[PDB]
Amino acid sequence: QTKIPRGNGPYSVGCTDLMFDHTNKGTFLRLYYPSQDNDRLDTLWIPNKEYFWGLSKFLGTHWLMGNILRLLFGSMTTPANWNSPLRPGEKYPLVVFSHGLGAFRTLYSAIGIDLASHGFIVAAVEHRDRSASATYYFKDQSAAEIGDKSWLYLRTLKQEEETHIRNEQVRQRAKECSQALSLILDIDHGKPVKNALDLKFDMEQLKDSIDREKIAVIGHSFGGATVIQTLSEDQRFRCGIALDAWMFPLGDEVYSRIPQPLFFINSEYFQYPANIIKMKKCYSPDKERKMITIRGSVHQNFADFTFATGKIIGHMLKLKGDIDSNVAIDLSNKASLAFLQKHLGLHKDFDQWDCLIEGDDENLIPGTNINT
Numbered sequence: 045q046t047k048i049p050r051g052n053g054p055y056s057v058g059c060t061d062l063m064f065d066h067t068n069k070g071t072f073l074r075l076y077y078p079s080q081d082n083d084r085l086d087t088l089w090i091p092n093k094e095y096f097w098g099l100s101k102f103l104g105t106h107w108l109m110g111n112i113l114r115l116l117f118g119s120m121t122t123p124a125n126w127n128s129p130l131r132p133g134e135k136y137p138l139v140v141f142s143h144g145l146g147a148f149r150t151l152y153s154a155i156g157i158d159l160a161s162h163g164f165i166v167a168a169v170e171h172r173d174r175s176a177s178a179t180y181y182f183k184d185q186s187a188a189e190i191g192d193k194s195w196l197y198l199r200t201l202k203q204e205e206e207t208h209i210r211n212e213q214v215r216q217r218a219k220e221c222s223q224a225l226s227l228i229l230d231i232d233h234g235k236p237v238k239n240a241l242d243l244k245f246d247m248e249q250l251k252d253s254i255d256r257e258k259i260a261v262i263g264h265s266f267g268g269a270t271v272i273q274t275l276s277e278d279q280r281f282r283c284g285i286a287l288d289a290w291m292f293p294l295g296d297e298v299y300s301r302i303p304q305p306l307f308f309i310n311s312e313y314f315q316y317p318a319n320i321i322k323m324k325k326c327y328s329p330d331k332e333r334k335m336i337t338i339r340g341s342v343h344q345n346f347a348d349f350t351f352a353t354g355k356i357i358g359h360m361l362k363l364k365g366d367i368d369s370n371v372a373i374d375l376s377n378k379a380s381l382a383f384l385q386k387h388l389g390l391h392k393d394f395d396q397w398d399c400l401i402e403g404d405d406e407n408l409i410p411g412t413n414i415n416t
């Protein structure tokens with residue numbers, strides 16, 4: 045079937061989408077969560093043709109390639125139970141997840157599904173900062189009722205625009221992570237919400253479902269910078285995991301304003317000194333910062349298209365590294381779970397992977413190959 049790996053944990057996984065409010069300033073997220081039932085693994089991975097058009101634009105091609113992607117991938121599933129009921133009787137720790145440049149909310153389901161299978165609720169935000177390849181919203185309530193979507197595509201920047209616009213974007217991304225957290229926490233305490241999407245998952249199930257002290261933010265690339273900006277602004281997030289962070293968007297002021305623990309998980313082949321030096325600026329003896337590098341990995345080992353092609357085409361497109369993609373994502377996910385247990389205070393068995401936080405594995409490098 046799909047080659048996106050099923051979650052390794054003992055919980056079955058459901059998935060749904062939530063948009064509220066309906067406007068371009070509302071929150072849009074894909075939720076992965078522990079499900080009551082494991083009926084059938086039928087979640088559509090990339091759910092609209094316009095995402096494929098957006099990806100082609102991001103990759104520098106035109107509408108013909110978008111339609112080719114749609115033919116290849118437009119019916120692929122990802123292994124979660126679409127709209128399955130939430131598993132009752134437990135309060136779950138919560139992760140807010142931020143996607144990279146040219147991605148969108150559905151492209152990190154390998155991570156989201158594995159976290160949910162270990163008993164997390166995961167809210168993968170879709171950013172409206174024009175960093176997503178595509179996203180959509182509704183211009184009024186009637187448009188939402190009809191499914192009359194307004195699409196917003198990735199913005200390309202002139203070199204003169206990069207410093208200012210990328211910092212504006214990372215600030216909007218952090219606001220969107222904090223707004224998504226507030227939406228979920230408000231639903232958890234009984235706020236009535238009318239999902240702008242008509243879906244057979246009743247959001248009232250989320251009432252009293254969140255362990256409100258155990259909140260983390262995780263993100264890849266642009267989303268790794270978003271982790272750091274979000275932690276700086278919002279202390280409801282108790283720790284962060286930055287997956288191959290692209291640090292360029294961040295202003296100098298954030299590096300001293302992050303009280304929470306922070307974990308950098310890097311690929312071997314993406315990092316460079318000008319990027320790594322900003323990660324080192326976060327280090328201080330009064331704070332917990334950990335860094336590991338996954339041997340033989342490329343930037344996109346963290347994103348779902350690392351599973352979507354064969355070994356040789358994937359390597360040529362830089363979707364795959366020297367390391368097997370399942371081995372790489374398992375290391376990132378297991379090290380993440382250990383870090384989350386330690387700094388959220390979970391009473392699980394994730395500390396069996398504490399050694400991964402130290403880089404103690406044949407496929408891990410403690411710290412970074414970039415000595416700067």
Ligand SMILES: N#Cc1cc(NS(=O)(=O)c2ccc(C(=O)O)cc2)ccc1Oc1ccc(Cl)c(C(F)(F)F)c1
Binds near residue numbers: 145344348
């Ligand atoms: N999965 C994911 C995925 C993730 C991202 N965001 S990112 O990982 O942060 C990232 C950031 C920057 C760069 C760069 O500056 O190059 C790259 C990546 C963007 C597009 C993606 O989707 C495809 C990527 C490649 C290809 Cl070939 C296709 C395909 F054509 F096959 F559909 C889709």
